[PDB]
Amino acid sequence: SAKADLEAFAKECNPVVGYWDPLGLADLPLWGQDQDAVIGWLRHSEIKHGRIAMAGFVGYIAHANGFRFGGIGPQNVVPEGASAPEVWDSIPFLAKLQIIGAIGVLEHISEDKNFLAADGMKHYMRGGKPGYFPTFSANVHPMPLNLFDPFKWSKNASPEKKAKGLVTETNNGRLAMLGLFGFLSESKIPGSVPALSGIIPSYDGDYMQPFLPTGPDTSLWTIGNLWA
Amino acid sequence: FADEFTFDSKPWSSSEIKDKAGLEALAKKLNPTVGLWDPLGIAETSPETIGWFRHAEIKHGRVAMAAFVGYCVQSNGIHFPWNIQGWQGTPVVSFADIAAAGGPADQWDALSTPAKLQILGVIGFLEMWSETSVVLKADGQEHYVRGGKPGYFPKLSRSDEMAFPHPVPLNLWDPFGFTSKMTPERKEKALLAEVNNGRLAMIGIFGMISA
Amino acid sequence: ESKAELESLAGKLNPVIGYWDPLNLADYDQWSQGQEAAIGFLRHAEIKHGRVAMAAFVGYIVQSNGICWPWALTGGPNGVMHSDILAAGGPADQWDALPTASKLQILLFVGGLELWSENSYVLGLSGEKHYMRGGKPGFFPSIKKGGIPHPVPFDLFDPFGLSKNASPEKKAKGLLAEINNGRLAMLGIMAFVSESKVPGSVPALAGKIAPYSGEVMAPFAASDNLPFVADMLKSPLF
Ligand SMILES: CC(=O)O[C@H]1CC(C)(C)C(=C=C/C(C)=C/C=C/C(C)=C/C=C/C=C(C)/C=C/C=C(\C)C(=O)C[C@@]23O[C@]2(C)C[C@@H](O)CC3(C)C)[C@](C)(O)C1
Ligand code: KC2
Ligand code: KC2
Ligand code: KC2
Ligand code: KC2
Ligand SMILES: CC1=C(C#C/C(C)=C/C=C/C(C)=C/C=C/C=C(C)/C=C/C=C(C)/C=C/[C@@]23O[C@]2(C)C[C@@H](O)CC3(C)C)C(C)(C)C[C@H](O)C1
Ligand SMILES: CC1=C(C#C/C(C)=C/C=C/C(C)=C/C=C/C=C(C)/C=C/C=C(C)/C=C/[C@@]23O[C@]2(C)C[C@@H](O)CC3(C)C)C(C)(C)C[C@H](O)C1
């Protein structure tokens, strides 16, 4: 049973706490689908949230402390000394659009039947591995590197080690979620995360609005900027 | 190489220490008084981590003793009689000028940037020659994390297939056989000594830096 | 434990009194889990109060006699010294003059210990069970054996293992002494705080316990700017 697998996974994550579902979301019938499909959805959502939160935390240290690529690019319109909430606000509108669009294409490839079937897998709600990004083996143009393990460092890793790695992924993703929203919360309700008192600056602007402020409308292309 | 870049463990096949009992044996051998002093409990780890800690301790011992002797010499002011720059149409700088720059930290600071880069490059070359598993296995050992002796520097002079394109005259450790043949366990006595004076030189060099 | 075993314990603690429950709180079923569970909870509460009160008695004596630590409590160019916390006033005033982070960290460390004790999985890993399920009424489990990711150097009870290899008779005698010394130290620390708030309440300590204005059953003082602290402190009480 998918619930039994989830409870065992929770025990692996933390045997002191074990399975901790105070709302019974694992028993909620999302979309009227059975418990196995709903648990697949919830595990995929947990892993996805955790992954993106870990990337968000590392990128918060990168942007706020000051870590930029050189050359012509979106980096040249963000003011120096800008804080992590102003970096996204300051990049060009096309940069925001194309970042979100590329993330969307990756989501689409993640849930497409074509790639998951070419990799001999199924959708995470239809008896598949929750949190599996397929190789780009069904994209039209042959694609150099895959998303997960692009250099294939885990081509020969034990299944037990992979299971432990997924157990690590869930826990570290949860903790990264807590830290990243600690950073966000300290800027819109000061004195909420006591350690960050005085570190994170206040930010006047809706975090959850992606395209506000719209940012500059510059044209950063140089050679062949006929569209300007 | 890509088959060995596993990021994971493989079974050990040597008598190197891979447990707390083995660590305790070496601990009493180093010093019967203290024994194993592991408050953080980094003996309760995997064989690869134990070997990693052992090699890290040994390497800190090497660098710390070398640093302490270099600090003492540079404080004594026994500079070199050569010129350190100015042969390919560059400015002239002398080891006397480097010495007169100040204390040994100031001397390193006064050292020119490409000189620093070249020194660090040689040290990195030595480091990766140490880490090369293929070189150790052409020689008689493995990577310290995967059951090798912690501290072994492979020979830089050789005629095997894994030999440099140009012949190298001598090796890093024991270039002229000053070790020659210690007895089969007097080498181990010297290893115990090395760990002890390495720890002492570690404390000494950090104390001097603090002062 | 059962009422018979509790009576045996009381007889061993003082063979003249024996079982002394004028309220019959042992028969008072609370938590609706049987007399065994109720007696387990009451015994755990007695032992925990005894331990905390004995430690607090020694802490009050040490702090009230000007024996602050040499090192600092807060770090920075302008950090509150342990000497400054001493000069804040009497021991309760020292606690109230602590930084908010210091108070929070102390009480949350204690809370983590309390959750660690309450967990039946950790207790089972250490052996024995919950105090309300047939376990030893006061028994802190092993922080090492529980399975914290980093191996802790020492456990909380008997870190250096000086009570290790103790005779079982010595163990039972020690748990009797723990309960009794607890029972007395509770009154000791409460009398210290009572002389602090109401002078002359405990007649013996006259002028030897410093005064105190704020409420003693109030971990957070006016200096602690956390949600609702000032609103809670707005109205004092006897
Ligand atoms: C958008 C835009 O405009 O961006 C701007 C900003 C940006 C991006 C920052 C820019 C930049 C900087 C960049 C990209 C710099 C790149 C630098 C680079 C790429 C530096 C490599 C050094 C490698 C070395 C020394 C290797 C030696 C290697 C050796 C010794 C060997 O060959 C050995 C060996 O192989 C042999 C010969 C063959 C075999 O027998 C044996 C082996 C295998 C052992 C640009 C250019 O300004 C553009
Ligand atoms: C920013 C994003 C991101 C972060 C920060 C992150 C961090 C960690 C950590 C660190 C705490 C661990 C220890 C860990 C472990 C594993 N990750 Mg993960 N990961 C991210 C992204 C992806 C993607 C896209 C995939 C993936 C996977 C796996 C597998 C499965 C291997 C297998 O079963 O073959 C294992 C063991 C692949 C998969 O199939 O997951 C079901 C997969 O496609 N990860 N991952
Ligand atoms: C991971 C995300 C990502 C992907 C996968 C991706 C793919 C493609 C493809 C697909 C094959 C094409 C054909 C394409 C083309 C252009 N991209 Mg694009 N791009 C991504 C990200 C960004 C960012 C951040 C920026 C950017 C831009 C431009 C400009 C316009 C330059 C200009 O008008 O000066 C052009 C012509 C820049 C921009 O619009 O700057 C105002 C800019 O900052 N892209 N991009
Ligand atoms: C500047 C750096 C440096 C210093 C300051 C230093 C000092 C001392 C002292 C102090 C008085 C003693 C007594 C001593 C003794 C031994 N050193 Mg050592 N040593 C340094 C560097 C290297 C390198 C690179 C290697 C090495 C080794 C050995 C072996 C093993 C021989 C064998 O069994 O083959 C023995 C007995 C080799 C090895 O395998 O070490 C595990 C090896 O590669 N040493 N070493
Ligand atoms: C503030 C903290 C504190 C104080 C100041 C304190 C004082 C005294 C005194 C003097 C007044 C005596 C004479 C005494 C004796 C014993 N204490 Mg004790 N104790 C404290 C805390 C704990 C904790 C956490 C545990 C514990 C225990 C034992 C055992 C073990 C018996 C066994 O092994 O069966 C014996 C004999 C452990 C246990 O198992 O108790 C059932 C246990 O977990 N104590 N304890
Ligand atoms: C490597 C890697 C990955 C990655 C990645 C990332 C971040 C990739 C991002 C790629 C990106 C951002 C690629 C932009 C391309 C832009 C193009 C082609 C623009 C053409 C522009 C053209 C053709 C313009 C032409 C003209 O103006 C010209 C010159 C003059 C006239 O004659 C004609 C006109 C006017 C039309 C994976 C796969 C995600 C995961 C894997 O694990 C590892
Ligand atoms: C400027 C210019 C010109 C020029 C020039 C030229 C040709 C310049 C050449 C410079 C050159 C050739 C510079 C070498 C440095 C080598 C160093 C520092 C080696 C250290 C080596 C060390 C420290 C080695 C140590 C050991 O090996 C020992 C001793 C024994 C071994 O057991 C162990 C190890 C390996 C550790 C022209 C031709 C005049 C005209 C032109 O127009 C412009």
Atom 30 (ligand 7): residue with closest C-alpha? B170
Distances (CA, A) of C114 to A47, B56, B138, C10: 31, 39, 57, 26
Backbone break loci in chain C, preceding residues, C–N > 2.5 A? none
A198 and chain C in contact, CB less than 8 A: no
State the Cα torsion C137-C140-C146-C149 to the nearest 10°: 150
C46 in a labelled binding site: yes
Residue C140's identity, in one-letter code, is F
DSSP per residue, A149-187 = STT-TTTT--HHHHHHHHHHHHHHHHHHHHHHHHHHHHH
Burial class (CB in 10 A: 0-12, 13-18, 19+), A181: middle
Distances (CA, A) of A43 to A34, A40, B102: 14, 5, 62
DSSP 8-class letter at C206: S
B57 in a labelled binding site: yes
Q: How many whole angstroms from B163 Cα to the centroid of ligand 4? A: 23
| A60, A183 contact by CB (below 8 A) | yes
User: Left (φ > 0), alpha (ψ -120 to 50) or beta: where does C235 sit?
Assistant: beta
Q: How many whole angstroms from A164 Cα to the centroid of ligand 4? A: 39
Q: What is the resolution of this structure in A?
A: 3.1
**Is the distance from the beta carbon of residue A78 to the nearest atom of ligand 3 less than 6 Å?**
no
| B110, B104 contact by CB (below 8 A) | no
| B133, B143 contact by CB (below 8 A) | yes
| B147, B13 contact by CB (below 8 A) | yes
CB within 8 Å: C147 and A15: yes
Phi, psi at B94, each rounded to 5°: -115, 155
CB within 8 Å: A16 and C119: yes
- Is the preceding omega at residue A213 within 30 degrees of 0, hence cis? yes
Residue C147's identity, in one-letter code, is G
Q: How many whole angstroms from A122 Cα to the centroid of ligand 1? A: 41
Q: If we measure between CA atoms, which residue out of C184, C159, C157 comes closest to residue C171?
A: C157
The SS3 assignment for A213 reads: coil
Testing the interface with B: which of C142, C145, C150, C154 to mutate, by most B Cβ within 10 A? C150
Q: How far is A3 from chain C (nearest CA, A)?
A: 21
Minimum Cα–Cα distance from A151: chain B residue: B2
C95 in a labelled binding site: no
Burial class (CB in 10 A: 0-12, 13-18, 19+), A48: middle
B100-107's contacts with Cβ under 8 Å and 24+ in sequence apart are B103/B74, B103/B75, B104/B70, B104/B71, B104/B74, B104/B75, B105/B209, B107/B74
Q: How many residues does chain A have?
A: 228
Residues 6+ apart with CB under 8 A from C123: C117, C129, C130, C135, C139, C141
| C38, C30 contact by CB (below 8 A) | yes
User: d(Cα B111, Cα A117) in Å, to the nearest integer?
Assistant: 61
A158 and chain B in contact, CB less than 8 A: yes
Q: How many whole angstroms from C70 Cα to the centroid of ligand 5? A: 29
CB within 8 Å: C153 and B44: no
Longest dimension (CA), chain B: 61
Phi, psi at B91, each rounded to 5°: -65, 155
Distances (CA, A) of C94 to A83, C97, C202: 39, 5, 22
Report the interhelical angle of C168-197 vs C3-13 (nearest 10°). 80
A191 and chain C in contact, CB less than 8 A: yes
Solving technique: cryo-EM
DSSP per residue, A88-147 = HHHS-HHHHHHHHHHHHHHHHHHH-HHHHHHTT---TTSS--TTPPPPSSSSSS--SS-S
Please, what is the Cα angle at A180 between A179 and A182, to 5 degrees? 60
User: d(Cα C222, Cα C206) in Å, to the nearest integer?
Assistant: 29
Bridge partners, residue B83, by sequence: B94
DSSP per residue, B35-58 = ----SS-TTSS-HHHHHHHHHHHH
User: d(Cα C106, Cα C220) in Å, to the nearest integer?
Assistant: 12
User: d(Cα A184, Cα B42) in Å, to the nearest integer?
Assistant: 36
Q: How many whole angstroms from C190 Cα to the centroid of ligand 5? A: 21
Residues 6+ apart with CB under 8 A from C212: C89, C90, C92, C93, C193, C196, C197
State the Cα torsion C47-C48-C54-C59 to the nearest 10°: 170
A185 in a labelled binding site: no
A222 and chain B in contact, CB less than 8 A: no
B59 in a labelled binding site: yes
Q: If we measure between CA atoms, which residue out of C78, C90, C88, C57 comes closest to residue C211?
A: C90
| B40, B32 contact by CB (below 8 A) | no
User: d(Cα A201, Cα C8) in Å, to the nearest integer?
Assistant: 64
Residues 6+ apart with CB under 8 A from A222: A72
User: d(Cα C44, Cα C129) in Å, to the nearest integer?
Assistant: 13
| B141, B148 contact by CB (below 8 A) | yes
Ligand 5 atom having least distance to the Cα of C139:
43
User: d(Cα B62, Cα B42) in Å, to the nearest integer?
Assistant: 22
Q: How far is A49 from chain B (nearest CA, A)?
A: 25
Count CB neighbours of C127 within 10 A. Answer: 12
Residues 6+ apart with CB under 8 A from C215: C236, C237
Burial class (CB in 10 A: 0-12, 13-18, 19+), C119: middle
Residues 6+ apart with CB under 8 A from A225: A219
Please, what is the Cα angle at C204 between C201 and C206, to 5 degrees? 75
Q: How far is A161 from chain B (nearest CA, A)?
A: 8
Distances (CA, A) of A153 to A129, A142, B1, B7: 20, 21, 11, 7
| C46, C183 contact by CB (below 8 A) | yes
User: d(Cα C237, Cα B111) in Å, to the nearest integer?
Assistant: 71
Which ligand has an atom closest to residue C157 CA? 5
Residues 6+ apart with CB under 8 A from A35: A1, A2, A3, A26, A27, A29
* The two three-digit tokens of residue C53, written as one number: 């009160």
User: d(Cα C209, Cα C194) in Å, to the nearest integer?
Assistant: 9
